[PDB]
C-alpha cells in the first residue's frame, strides 16, 4: 500500500481503493491493453515500411502481403521477387545529410546560461555533458534513432541516470600480469593475486528504444508529454539485484525464477527475420522476464496520482513513487512531421509507400516479361532431306535442303517495354520529388530544424537538467577539466540553461562583430573615441570569443 | 571449482550448482549452439555476398 | 548464480580457464559495423540491399 | 550526393571501429605498459585504478581532423589578438602569458615548451 | 580514414595529463606502425563492406603476447667468403631472442566468430570465438599455468 500523500495526488471521490497496489496494476495492464489495441493500424505501416527498406526475400515476402491494402486489388505474384532499394536509398540519403547538419563537427552543442552569473558552471556543465556523450557512444545510439525515426516517423531514446543504467562497483580477484615477455620459468600460480575495484554498467547510458515495444497514449498530442509505456527484458540476476537493493518490494527473489518467460513481439521477430536472426528460440537463455514500466498519470477510482513511475511484473505492481526526475521522464520521443491528433508522426516513407510498391511491382512484372522477351527461336517444317538434327549455326555453314523457307526465325511482336520504363521513370521522378531528395535544400533544412529542435535540444535538456540534479561539485571538477544546493523552483529560473546546436560559433562571430562595428565607427573620431567603457567592449568580446577560460586572458 | 566471490556475481537461486566447471561448460557449448544456429540464414547472406 | 564479464577457454567439452575480464577497457575484440538496425547486432552491408 | 553517402559512411565507420579500437588500445596500454618501458619503447626522457582511469587519467581519441581542430583554436586566439591589438587601452590589457602558452600547446608540436625561453 | 600517417590524436581530459597523453600517443603510433594495422584493418574494412559485420582482435590477448628464448647459432664475423672459409670454425653464440606466437593485430573471420542474436550493440554482446590453436600452444599454456583442467 503506497503512501498517497507522497505523490501529487487529487482526490477525486468519497472511498479510495482498497488496495492501491492492485488497483494500479490493472489499471497499468488495462492502458497497456488500450495502447497496443489503438495503434494497430500504425504498427502494421512501420512494419512494411522496415520492409521496403529493407532488401531481403523475406521483406519482399512481407511486401507482397501488404499490396492489396496498399495499392488495392493487383496482381503481385511475379516470380522476379527484386526490389529496387529506392526506399533504402531515400532513408540512407536523408540520413547522410541529417547527419552532416547535426554533427558538422566535434563542438556541436553550447550551453548558454540565462542569468549571466552562472557562466562559469555553464562552461562546467558543457564540458561534463562533452564527456558524458563521448564515453556513452551517444552518436551511434542517435544514428540508429534517427535511422528509425526517418522509416517510422517516431522514434525513441533512453538517456542515462535510469535505475538500470548507474554504475556499481565490485570486487575482483585476478592474476596480476607484471611482465611483458614470457620466459620458461612462466608460472600463472606464482603470480601475485590483486582484487581489484571495478566499476560497471548492466545496461548503455544511451539507447535507442524499439518503437513495437515502447507505447504511448493514442489521445495525446504532445509525444514527449504523453503517457509512456515500456516493455522492458530483464534477467532473473537483474530483477535479484533490484530486490536485494530494495527497488523490487512486492516480489519473491525465489518467486522470479518461476515467474513467466518474456515473450517476443511478433513485429519484432518479423523486424527480426528481415535481417535473418531467428530471435525464436529453442531457448530464450530462460533468462529474461517481461517488465512493464510506466510513466505518467495514473487515473484511479476515487484518487488520481500525477507523474509517477511504476514497474510491474507480469500482474503485480511491484514499484511505484513519484517521479524522480525533475526535467521529466528520461525518455525523449522524436517525430518527423506532427500532425494535430496523433502522438506518432509521418515518416519519410509513408507518403511515397504505395509508389515504393507500385514500381517493384513494375520492376518486376517486365523483368517476367523481358525473360521471355529476350530468346531467338526457330521454326522447321517437315520435309525429306532437312534433319533436325542437322540445324545447327555454324559460321557459313550450307543447309542442303529442298526448299528455301524450311527453317524459319520466329517473329516476335512489338514489345510495350517503352511504357514500362517511361512509367518507372516518373514514379522514380515522383518519389525523390515528393521526399526532397532532388528546394531539396530547403526540405532537408526544414526536416533538420525541426528534428534539432524537438530531438537533440529536448536531449541536452534533459540530461543537462539531470545532471545538475545527480552530479556533485567534486565529481563534476574531476570529470571536466577544472580546478550545490538547487531546488526544482530555482532550477528553471536562475541555474538555467538554453541548449543550442553548431549555430553558438555564428551567434559568437555575430555578437563580436557589432561590438566591432561600434568600436570602428566610434574609434575614428577623437570626441567619441574617449567615451568609450574599453573595460566592458574587451570584457564582453573576450566572454563571447569562445574561450573555455577566458578571464585568463585579462591581466 | 572456480572460486565465485572472485568473480562478479549474483546468487540467483538457494542451491548452486554441483560441478561448475561442467555447468560453464555446458552453458558454453548451448550458448555457441544457439547463436550459430540462430543464424543461418544471415550466414547464407555473407556467403552469397562473398560469392 | 550468474557470472558477470568473464573470459572462458573450453578444449572438447571441457572448462580448461575460467577467469574474470583482465581487461578494464572490455574484450580485445572490436566488432564493426555499417548499418546498425534497432534488433539485430548484424549490419547491412554495401551489397546486402542489391 | 555520393560524396555526402561516403562521407556519412565514413563518419559512422570512424566513430564506430577507428575510435573504439584507439579506446581499447590506450586503455589497455595504460593497463598493461609501465613506465620505463613505455619510455624506452618511445622518444622520451604508475599506479592507476578503473575508477580514475575513468576520470582524471582519461584520453579522448580523434581522427585527422585534429590538424582542424587545433587550426580553429589558434586562429579563434590570433583573431581576438588582432583585434585587440589595434586599440591601444586594450591592447595593454591582455594576457599574453597565457595566450601564447595555449597557443604552442595547440600548435600541434611534440614538446611545445621546449620553445618558450 | 588514413589520408597521411598522423592519422589519429589523443586529447587528454585533464589538461594536466598532456606529456602522459603525448607519450601514449606515441607509443600508439609505433605499435601501430609495428603490428602492421593497416593490412589488418584493410581486410577487416573488406570483409565489413561485403558482410556489413567484422571483427578484429587486438594485442595484448595471451596468445599475442611476447616472449623470450634462447637460441645457438653461428655468426658470420666476415664480410667475403675466401678459400679458408669453413663454418665450422665460426663463433657459436647463444643469442636471446623475442618473438610472438599470433599477430597484435588480426582480422578475424564472420563464420568463426557468433554473437548473441537478441543483443542490440555489437560491442556490449556476448562473444564467442572458434580458434585454431597447435598442441605446442596447448603445451605452452599447460606449462604457463593458463590452462588447468586438461592433460
Given at each position: 500500500?503506497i503512501r498517497?500523500?507522497?505523490?501529487?495526488?487529487?482526490?477525486?471521490?468519497?472511498?479510495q481503493?482498497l488496495d492501491?497496489?492492485?488497483?494500479?496494476?490493472?489499471?497499468?495492464?488495462?492502458?497497456?491493453?488500450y495502447f497496443?489495441d489503438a495503434?494497430?493500424v500504425?504498427?502494421?505501416t512501420?512494419?512494411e515500411?522496415?520492409?521496403?527498406?529493407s532488401?531481403?526475400?523475406?521483406?519482399?515476402d512481407?511486401?507482397?502481403?501488404?499490396t492489396?491494402?496498399?495499392?488495392?486489388e493487383?496482381?503481385?505474384?511475379?516470380?522476379?521477387?527484386?526490389?529496387?532499394?529506392?526506399?533504402?536509398?531515400?532513408?540512407?540519403t536523408?540520413?547522410?545529410?541529417?547527419?552532416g547538419?547535426?554533427?558538422?563537427?566535434?563542438?556541436?552543442?553550447?550551453?548558454?546560461?540565462?542569468?549571466?552569473g552562472?557562466?562559469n558552471?555553464?562552461?562546467?556543465?558543457?564540458?561534463?555533458?562533452?564527456k558524458?556523450?563521448?564515453?556513452?557512444?551517444?552518436?551511434?545510439?542517435?544514428?540508429?534513432?534517427?535511422?528509425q525515426?526517418?522509416?517510422?516517423g517516431?522514434?525513441?531514446?533512453?538517456?542515462?541516470?535510469?535505475?538500470?543504467?548507474?554504475?556499481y562497483?565490485?570486487?575482483?580477484?585476478?592474476k596480476?600480469?607484471?611482465?611483458?615477455?614470457?620466459d620458461?620459468?612462466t608460472q600463472?600460480?606464482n603470480y601475485?593475486t590483486?582484487?581489484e575495484?571495478?566499476v560497471?554498467?548492466?545496461a548503455?547510458?544511451?539507447?535507442?528504444l524499439?518503437?513495437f515495444d515502447?507505447?504511448?497514449?493514442?489521445?495525446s498530442n504532445?509525444?514527449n508529454?504523453?503517457?509512456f509505456?515500456?516493455?522492458?527484458k530483464?534477467?532473473?540476476?537483474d530483477?535479484?539485484?533490484?530486490?536485494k537493493r530494495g527497488?523490487?518490494?512486492?516480489?519473491?527473489?525465489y518467486?522470479?525464477?518461476?515467474?513467466?518467460a518474456?515473450e517476443?513481439?511478433?513485429?519484432?521477430?518479423?523486424?527480426?527475420?528481415?535481417?535473418?536472426i531467428?530471435?525464436?528460440?529453442?531457448?530464450?537463455?530462460?533468462?529474461?522476464?517481461?517488465?512493464?514500466?510506466?510513466?505518467?498519470?495514473?487515473?484511479?477510482?476515487?484518487?488520481?496520482?500525477?507523474?509517477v513511475?511504476?514497474?510491474?511484473?507480469?500482474?503485480?505492481?511491484?514499484?511505484?513513487?513519484?517521479?524522480?526526475?525533475?526535467?521529466?521522464?528520461?525518455f525523449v520521443?522524436?517525430?518527423?512531421?506532427?500532425?494535430?491528433e496523433?502522438p506518432?508522426?509521418?515518416?519519410?516513407?509513408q507518403?511515397?509507400?504505395?509508389?515504393?510498391?507500385?514500381?517493384?511491382i513494375?520492376?518486376?512484372q517486365?523483368?517476367?516479361?523481358?525473360?521471355?522477351?529476350?530468346?531467338?527461336?526457330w521454326?522447321?517444317?517437315?520435309?525429306?532431306?532437312?534433319?533436325?538434327?542437322?540445324?545447327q549455326?555454324?559460321?557459313?555453314?550450307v543447309?542442303?535442303?529442298?526448299s528455301?523457307?524450311?527453317?524459319?526465325?520466329?517473329?516476335?511482336?512489338?514489345?510495350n517495354?517503352?511504357?514500362?520504363?517511361?512509367?518507372?521513370?516518373?514514379?522514380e521522378s515522383?518519389?525523390?520529388r515528393?521526399t526532397?531528395?532532388?528546394a531539396?535544400?530547403?526540405?532537408?533544412s526544414?526536416?533538420?530544424r525541426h528534428?534539432?529542435?524537438?530531438?537533440?535540444?529536448?536531449?541536452?535538456r534533459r540530461?543537462?537538467?539531470?545532471a545538475?540534479q545527480?552530479?556533485?561539485?567534486?565529481?563534476?571538477?574531476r570529470?571536466?577539466?577544472?580546478?550545490?544546493?538547487?531546488?526544482?523552483?530555482?532550477?528553471?529560473?536562475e541555474?538555467?540553461?538554453?541548449?543550442?546546436?553548431?549555430?553558438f560559433?555564428?551567434?559568437?562571430?555575430?555578437?563580436?562583430?557589432?561590438?566591432?562595428?561600434?568600436?570602428?565607427?566610434?574609434?575614428?573620431?577623437?570626441?567619441?573615441?574617449?567615451?568609450?567603457?574599453?573595460?566592458?567592449?574587451?570584457?564582453?568580446?573576450?566572454?563571447?570569443?569562445?574561450?573555455?577560460?577566458?578571464?585568463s586572458?585579462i591581466?
Amino acid at each position: 500500500m503506497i503512501r498517497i500523500k507522497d505523490f501529487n495526488h487529487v482526490i477525486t471521490g468519497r472511498e479510495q481503493p482498497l488496495d492501491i497496489n492492485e488497483a494500479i496494476a490493472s489499471y497499468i495492464t488495462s492502458r497497456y491493453v488500450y495502447f497496443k489495441d489503438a495503434r494497430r493500424v500504425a504498427e502494421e505501416t512501420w512494419l512494411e515500411a522496415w520492409s521496403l527498406y529493407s532488401g531481403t526475400p523475406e521483406a519482399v515476402d512481407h511486401q507482397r502481403t501488404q499490396t492489396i491494402n496498399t495499392v488495392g486489388e493487383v496482381n503481385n505474384d511475379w516470380r522476379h521477387r527484386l526490389n529496387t532499394g529506392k526506399a533504402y536509398e531515400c532513408i540512407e540519403t536523408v540520413h547522410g545529410y541529417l547527419m552532416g547538419a547535426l554533427f558538422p563537427n566535434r563542438e556541436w552543442f553550447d550551453l548558454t546560461p540565462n542569468n549571466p552569473g552562472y557562466a562559469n558552471e555553464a562552461r562546467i556543465i558543457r564540458k561534463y555533458l562533452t564527456k558524458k556523450f563521448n564515453e556513452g557512444k551517444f552518436r551511434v545510439s542517435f544514428e540508429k534513432y534517427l535511422r528509425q525515426l526517418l522509416v517510422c516517423g517516431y522514434s525513441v531514446m533512453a538517456l542515462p541516470w535510469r535505475y538500470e543504467s548507474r554504475p556499481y562497483k565490485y570486487n575482483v580477484t585476478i592474476k596480476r600480469e607484471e611482465n611483458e615477455y614470457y620466459d620458461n620459468s612462466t608460472q600463472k600460480a606464482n603470480y601475485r593475486t590483486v582484487t581489484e575495484n571495478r566499476v560497471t554498467r548492466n545496461a548503455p547510458e544511451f539507447e535507442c528504444l524499439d518503437v513495437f515495444d515502447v507505447y504511448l497514449s493514442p489521445t495525446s498530442n504532445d509525444p514527449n508529454e504523453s503517457d509512456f509505456i515500456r516493455r522492458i527484458k530483464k534477467t532473473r540476476a537483474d530483477i535479484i539485484t533490484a530486490i536485494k537493493r530494495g527497488y523490487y518490494t512486492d516480489i519473491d527473489p525465489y518467486d522470479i525464477v518461476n515467474m513467466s518467460a518474456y515473450e517476443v513481439n511478433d513485429r519484432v521477430d518479423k523486424l527480426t527475420s528481415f535481417q535473418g536472426i531467428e530471435t525464436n528460440h529453442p531457448y530464450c537463455m530462460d533468462d529474461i522476464i517481461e517488465v512493464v514500466e510506466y510513466w505518467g498519470d495514473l487515473h484511479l477510482d476515487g484518487v488520481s496520482l500525477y507523474d509517477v513511475k511504476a514497474t510491474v511484473i507480469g500482474q503485480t505492481l511491484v514499484c511505484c513513487e513519484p517521479n524522480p526526475f525533475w526535467a521529466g521522464k528520461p525518455f525523449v520521443v522524436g517525430s518527423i512531421t506532427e500532425l494535430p491528433e496523433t502522438p506518432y508522426s509521418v515518416g519519410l516513407l509513408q507518403p511515397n509507400m504505395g509508389l515504393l510498391h507500385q514500381l517493384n511491382i513494375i520492376t518486376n512484372q517486365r523483368c517476367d516479361n523481358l525473360e521471355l522477351a529476350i530468346d531467338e527461336m526457330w521454326t522447321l517444317v517437315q520435309n525429306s532431306s532437312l534433319n533436325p538434327d542437322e540445324v545447327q549455326v555454324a559460321p557459313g555453314k550450307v543447309f542442303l535442303v529442298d526448299s528455301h523457307d524450311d527453317l524459319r526465325p520466329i517473329q516476335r511482336g512489338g514489345n510495350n517495354f517503352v511504357v514500362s520504363y517511361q512509367e518507372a521513370g516518373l514514379l522514380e521522378s515522383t518519389i525523390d520529388r515528393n521526399t526532397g531528395t532532388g528546394a531539396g535544400g530547403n526540405r532537408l533544412s526544414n526536416i533538420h530544424r525541426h528534428i534539432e529542435d524537438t530531438s537533440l535540444m529536448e536531449i541536452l535538456r534533459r540530461v543537462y537538467r539531470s545532471a545538475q540534479q545527480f552530479v556533485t561539485e567534486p565529481e563534476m571538477i574531476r570529470v571536466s577539466g577544472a580546478k550545490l544546493e538547487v531546488d526544482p523552483e530555482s532550477l528553471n529560473k536562475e541555474y538555467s540553461l538554453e541548449p543550442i546546436g553548431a549555430d553558438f560559433v555564428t551567434d559568437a562571430t555575430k555578437y563580436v562583430r557589432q561590438r566591432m562595428d561600434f568600436i570602428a565607427f566610434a574609434s575614428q573620431i577623437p570626441q567619441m573615441a574617449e567615451r568609450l567603457n574599453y573595460e566592458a567592449l574587451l570584457n564582453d568580446v573576450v566572454n563571447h570569443s569562445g574561450f573555455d577560460d577566458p578571464y585568463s586572458y585579462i591581466v
